[PDB]
Subunit: 254 residues, 4 copies
C-alpha cells in the first residue's frame, strides 16, 4: 500500500539523516574527534540501517535519484515516483529539524564563543552540518561533475550488489555492503562536495537550515551560482548514467 | 528456566558494561586515543557480543527498558520482568566494580597527578567512566528528551532488525547489526547525554561509583535536579514509544 | 565471453583504484585525517566492492599477479592471461586519471602553497597519491622482499578464503574477508612499500603520474635503481610462492 | 594427520603475530597513527584470518591456553596437546623474526635518533613491539589478575560463539566474531597488560626479542619479578576458568 511505503521512505530517509547530520553536528559544535573515514562510515552505516528498516515495505529507495533511476530502468511504478520523492524530502527535512532540536544549545554556544554570525558567509561552515557545500578550490561545474560521477557509481554498485544473477547472491548482506560502499565513496570523494548524491538528503536539510537562521547562504553556499542545484540535479543525472552503465557493460554479460 | 535466564542476563549486561566502561576507563585514566565513533563502536560491538552470549537462553534483553517494552508489546512473561531487571542491574553493578578493580591504580595515580578530589564536582568527569552525564550546555528536560528519542529509535530498530516478516531475515547477523545501530546512535547523539538508553547500564554503575568515593555527585552530576532520573525513566518511556511506533507505522504494513 | 570479462576487469581494477588513490588524495592534498589503519581499511574494502562487482563475470582477478598465479596453479585459461592483464592495467590507468580529474585543483593549490615543484624529487610525496614508493630507510632489495612476502600471503589467503574444502565455506562473505585481509596487510606492512602487491595497481597509475607532470621520478621514486620494478615483479614472484605454499602446506592436507 | 595440523597451527599463529606485531612495529618505529581501538581491531581481525586459514585443518587453537582448555573440557586428544603447543610457539617465534626482518632498518634508525640503547631498561618500549609488558602503575599480581580474567572471557565467549546449541548458529561468521571479541578485550583491557592471553603469542616473540639484542629485559620488562611468567601462566589459568564457567553457568542451561 502506497501510504505505508511513503511512511517507510519518510522514516528511512529521516533515520539516515538523523545519524548523518548528527555525527556532523557532534564534529562541528560538540568538538568530537572524527576523521574523513569515520564521518563516511557513520553515514554509510546509517544508510544501511535505514535500508534494513524499510526495504521490506517501500523497497528502500530513500533517494530521489535512486527512485527516478529505478523508474527509468527497473520498471518502477511511475505513479509511485512523486509520492516517494515527497516522502524522502519530508523525512530528511524533519530529521534535520530533530537533530537541530537535540543539539540546539551547542549551535548557539558555539556561534557565540567563536563570534559566528548565523546567516553570514562565514556561517556556511556550520550550515554544512545539514547539507553539502563545494570545496573552496572548485567551482559549480567541477562540483557538478563530482556528484554526477559518484552517484553513477552509487547506483551502478547498488544494482551490482542487489543483482542476484551477478556472482553469489548477498542476501541479508546487501544493505550493509551498500553502506560500506557509501562509506568509501565518502572517504575517497567526500572532501570535494560532501558526497551528497541524494537530492532529498541535501535539499530538505538545506531548506531547514534556511528557516533556522542561515538564510540565503544555506542555498548559495556563499557563491555566485546557487549551489543547491548541484546536489539537486547532479545526483539525478549520474544515477541514470550509472543505472544505464550497469545494464549495458555488466548486466548484458550475465 | 528463569534462574538460568537471570544468570544469562546478569552476565550479558556485565559483559556489555565490561567492554563499555572499560574502553572509557582507558580513555580517561589510561590516556588511550579514542574518538566519538570508536567509543561508540566499542560499546555497540560489546553489546553485540553480550547478545550472542545470552540470546539463546534469556532472549538477551540486557536492558530494563527493553524488558518493560517487550512485556507491554511483545507478550513477554510479566512474571519474568522484575527478575530480569534485578539481574541486569546487578551484572552492570558487578561489571563496573570489576573494571574499577583492574584499572584501580590508574584512577588514583591520575587523580593525584591532575589534583582531582574524588567526590568533588570536578570528579564527575572521571565518574563518567561508569555512567552517563548531561553535556554542559543542556538541562534536565533537554537531556530527558535525548534519552527518550534515541531509546525509541533503539527499540524501534531492534524490532525492525529482528522482525522476520520485514524484508529478508537477518539470521545470525541480527546481533551484530544491533551493535552497529548502537554505534551510530552513540556517535550521532552521544555527546549530549552519553547515549545511556539502558536504566541498568547507568544506575548500577552509578551506584558503584557512589560507593567508591564519588559520593552524591555520582547521582547528581553536580546539578540541581538529580541526574540519575533521566537515564532511569527517559529510556523506559522512549522504549515504549519506539516499540509502539514500530507496531503502528511499520509492522501494521507488513 | 572474453570481451565481457575484460570489461569487468577494467571496471573492477578501476573501481579499486578509484577508492584507493582517492582516499590517499584526500589525505595528501585535501588535508583529511587518516591513520595507517583507515587508509588500509579503505583500500581493503574498496577491493572488496570491486570483487562483488566483477566476480560473477570475470572471476575478479583485478591483479596481474593473481592472474598469472591462477594460470600456473588454478588451471586458468592462458589465452585469457594477457587480455586480463591489459584490462587491469588500463582500468587502473583511467581510474587514476579520473581521481586526478576530480582532485585537480587541490593538487595545484597544494603545490603552490607548499612550494612544491611537480616532477622534482620532493614531489614524489604527492606522486605517492597514485602508486607506491619505498620507505626512506630501505633499499631496492629490501623493498622487493616486502612486496614478495606480502603478496605471497595475499595469494595464499585468497585461496584459503575461497577454498570450499577448507573449513565452513564463506559464501558471500569471501570478498569482504579478502578486503579485511588486504586491510591488515596494509596496516602491518604498509609503511614499508605502500602494500602495492598488484602490478596493475602500481604501473598504470605510475604511468599516469608520469604523464601528468611528475616525469621520471614517478618511476624512479628519486632513487638509483628504478623503483617501478619492485611493484612490477615482486608481486608476481610472491603470488606464485603464495599459491604454491597453499597447495603444498594446506591444500594437500584437506 | 597430526603433522598437517601442526603445520596449520604453526602458520596460523605466525599469521596472527605477523599482523599483530606488524601494526605495533608501524606504530613504534614507523610513526603511523594508531589509537587503542585500531591496534585492537587489527590484532582481532588478524586472529580472525588466522582462524579462517587453519580451522578446517587443525581446528585453529593458535593458543596454548585454548589447547589446554579444549583438552580438559572439550575432549581434545591429549596426544595432540604438546605437538600443538610447540607449533604455536614456533610459528609466533618465526613470525616475530619475519616482522623484525622487514622492519629491521626502522628499528635501528629509530633507536639511533632517539638515543635508545637496545637491551637497556628504556628499550622495553620498543621490545613491546613483540610481546606484552605491564602498565607502569601495576605490579606482578595485579597484572596476573588481568590476563587471567580476560582470557577467561576469551575462552568463555569463544565457546559461546561456537556453541551451536546456543542461539542461532553463526556458521562462517564465527571466526570474524571471535576477532571483534578480541578487539573489544584489547580496547577495554589492553592498556593494562597488552591483552596477551596467549602463552605462545608472548613467549615466542619474547624469546626472539631476547636474541635480537633486548637481552634480559625482554623477559623481565625491567621489573623485580620476571614478567614473562604472567603471559605464560595467567592465560592458562583463566582459559580453564572461562571454559569451566561456560559449561556451568551457560551450557548447563541450554
Ligand atoms: C518541524 C518544523 C520546523 C519549522 C522550522 C523551525 C526552525 C526553528 O529555528 C529557528 O529559526 C528562527 C528563524 O530564523 C531563528 O531565529 C532561530 O534562531 C532558530 O532556532
Ligand atoms: C524538489 C525541490 C525543488 C526545488 C525548486 C527550486 C527551489 C529554489 O529555492 C529558492 O532559491 C532561491 C535562490 O537562492 C531563494 O532566493 C529562494 O528563497 C528559494 O525559495
Ligand atoms: C562487588 C562489591 C563491591 C563493593 C564496593 C567496593 C568499593 C571499593 O571502592 C572504595 O570505596 C571506598 C569508600 O568510598 C573508597 O574510600 C576507596 O577509595 C574506593 O577504592
Ligand atoms: C531500580 C532503581 C531504583 C532507584 C530508586 C531511587 C534511588 C535514589 O537514590 C538516592 O538518591 C539520593 C539523591 O541523590 C541520594 O541522596 C541517596 O543517597 C540515594 O540512595
Ligand atoms: C585519460 C587520458 C589521460 C591522458 C593524460 C592526461 C594528463 C593530464 O595532466 C597534465 O599533464 C601535463 C603534461 O605533463 C601537465 O603539464 C599538467 O600539469 C597536467 O595536468
Ligand atoms: C606491463 C608493464 C611493462 C613495463 C615495461 C618497462 C617500462 C619502463 O618504462 C620506462 O622507464 C624508464 C626508466 O625510468 C623511463 O626512462 C622511460 O621513459 C619509461 O618508458
Ligand atoms: C629465524 C631465526 C632467527 C634467529 C635470531 C636472529 C636474531 C637477529 O637479530 C640480531 O641479534 C644480534 C644478537 O643480539 C644483535 O646484535 C643484532 O642487532 C640483531 O639484529
Ligand atoms: C614453553 C615455555 C617454557 C618457559 C620456561 C621458562 C624459561 C625462562 O627463561 C629464562 O628466564 C631467565 C630469567 O629472566 C633468563 O635468565 C634465562 O636466560 C631464560 O632462559
Amino acid at each position: 500500500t502506497l501510504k505505508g511505503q511513503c511512511i517507510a521512505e519518510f522514516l528511512g530517509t529521516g533515520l539516515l539523516i538523523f545519524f548523518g547530520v548528527g555525527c556532523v553536528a557532534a564534529l562541528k559544535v560538540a568538538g568530537a574527534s572524527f576523521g574523513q573515514w569515520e564521518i563516511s562510515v557513520i553515514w554509510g552505516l546509517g544508510v544501511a540501517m535505514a535500508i534494513y528498516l524499510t526495504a521490506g515495505v517501500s523497497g528502500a529507495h530513500l533517494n530521489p535519484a535512486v527512485t527516478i533511476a529505478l523508474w527509468l530502468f527497473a520498471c518502477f511504478d511511475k505513479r509511485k515516483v512523486i509520492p516517494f520523492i515527497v516522502s524522502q524530502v519530508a523525512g530528511a527535512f524533519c530529521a534535520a529539524a530533530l537533530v537541530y532540536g537535540l543539539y540546539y544549545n551547542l549551535f548557539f554556544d558555539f556561534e557565540q564563543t567563536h563570534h559566528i554570525v548565523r546567516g553570514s558567509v562565514e556561517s556556511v561552515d556550520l550550515a554544512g552540518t545539514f547539507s553539502t557545500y563545494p570545496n573552496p578550490h572548485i567551482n559549480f561545474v567541477q562540483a557538478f561533475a563530482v556528484e554526477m560521477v559518484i552517484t553513477a557509481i552509487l547506483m551502478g554498485l547498488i544494482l551490482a550488489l542487489t543483482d542476484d544473477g551477478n556472482g553469489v547472491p548477498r542476501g541479508p548482506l546487501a544493505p550493509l555492503l551498500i553502506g560500506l560502499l557509501i562509506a568509501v565513496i565518502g572517504a575517497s570523494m567526500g572532501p570535494l562536495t560532501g558526497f551528497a548524491m541524494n537530492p532529498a538528503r541535501d535539499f530538505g536539510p538545506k531548506v531547514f537550515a534556511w528557516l533556522a537562521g542561515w538564510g540565503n547562504v544555506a542555498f548559495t553556499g556563499g557563491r555566485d551560482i546557487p549551489y543547491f542545484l548541484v546536489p539537486l540535479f547532479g545526483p539525478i543525472v549520474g544515477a541514470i548514467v550509472g543505472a544505464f552503465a550497469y545494464r549495458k557493460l555488466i548486466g548484458r554479460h550475465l
